[PDB]
């Protein structure tokens, strides 16, 4: 009973390409209780509504969270290219999702701010014809292929990272580049929700 959103509130939220995932089954949630803590700037859903997602019984609820500047709102859409959706974070297009962009108020203190916002501007693979570059796109509910060579904080806007690939990996080189955005007055964060439904197990229910 009772779904636990506490880890989200303790410490420094990771960068988008290192999003933290909390998985919930068999509990009772109060979603507007959690959103009462933040100033909510954007709230858009897919195959569900902000009203419906706060009041349905699911077989599973997945909550990704990460630091994210409001200024890059438009980059969340899989529409456009957008380094975010291509190389950093991509929600399931199969399951019902929601995306929320919120600011943490001053009176919220347990959430610490990082030095800046970081993201991956390029994740590509130099084919072994060392001329052709093939983008390495992030999959739904997965992390970027480049997460192993990019540090959790991008050092200096424009930094490059490369790894020589063994023939097991197909050979060639993995190439990534990182970009940075200055920290805001109050930290800004993004939350991605994915829900699942079935036949005999929808135990993630709102608390009454």
């Amino acid at each position, epitope marked *: 009973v009772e779904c636990d959103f506490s880890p989200l509130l303790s410490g420094t939220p990771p960068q988008v390409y290192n999003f933290k995932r909390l998985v919930f089954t068999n509990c009772n949630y109060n979603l507007t209780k959690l959103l009462s803590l933040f100033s909510v700037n954007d709230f858009t859903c897919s195959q569900i509504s902000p009203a419906a997602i706060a009041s349905n019984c699911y077989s599973s609820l997945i909550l990704d969270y990460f630091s994210y500047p409001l200024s890059m709102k438009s980059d969340l859409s899989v529409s456009s290219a957008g380094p975010i959706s291509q190389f950093n974070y991509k929600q399931s297009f199969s399951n019902p999702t929601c995306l929320i962009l919120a600011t943490v108020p001053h009176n919220l203190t347990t959430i610490t701010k990082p030095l800046k916002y970081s993201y991956i501007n390029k994740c590509s693979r130099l084919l*072994s014809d060392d001329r052709t570059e093939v983008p390495q796109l992030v999959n739904a*509910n997965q992390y970027s292929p480049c997460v192993s060579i990019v540090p959790s904080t991008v050092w200096e806007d424009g930094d490059y990272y490369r790894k020589q690939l063994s023939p*097991l*990996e*197909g050979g060639g080189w993995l190439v990534a580049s990182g970009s940075t955005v200055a920290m805001t007055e109050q930290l800004q964060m993004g939350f991605g929700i994915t829900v699942q439904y079935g036949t005999d197990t929808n135990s993630v229910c709102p608390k009454l």
Partner: antibody
Amino acid sequence: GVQLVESGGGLVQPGRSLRLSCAASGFTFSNYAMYWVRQAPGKGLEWVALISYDISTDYYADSVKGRFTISRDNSKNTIYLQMNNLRTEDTALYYCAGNDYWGQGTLVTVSS
Amino acid sequence: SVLTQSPSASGTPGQRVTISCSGSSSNIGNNYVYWYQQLPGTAPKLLIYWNDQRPSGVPDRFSGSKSGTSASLAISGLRSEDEADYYCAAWDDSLSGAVFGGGTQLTVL
């Protein structure tokens, strides 16, 4: 879509030679390194040989080192496994399948 | 030099199973580990790429783990269609070759 079809399988006397062919489609052949894998009747998988995308570096398992020769034609999008000094242990289903996509193999039964 | 797999594994529908794949440093640790499924009478299909990545179509139920000397494949919510043989793969930079595991025949009761 990515399609892979193996060819050249049949009966081939031991110590004879047999060359296998692999027709690929649905992707840029020249851009992927390729594999050769075999499976003896009712047995587990065993790697054979490897060719880089371009024909450059090529590596082998000691079971086939010196006998088998891996090649390809990036202008014909075709893969070749030139097997020499074939043995009874070489009786297997030979699959040609750049990992992430896999085709139905081809039977290579000894001489007999 | 070799990849050691348990030959078999079992579980009930809905259960969770973990298939292990032990190796060395020249194979596992420095090179990624790969996971494949073979159903009766069919060609092998990619399950897990780059230690822990699922290609398009692979259900989230399948997950990979990687440590220094070993690797693992966790299967949650087991189903009868999962009854098959499971193989792990790694590279020998020294032998300059791919090496396969012995395979784990998973029977779903």
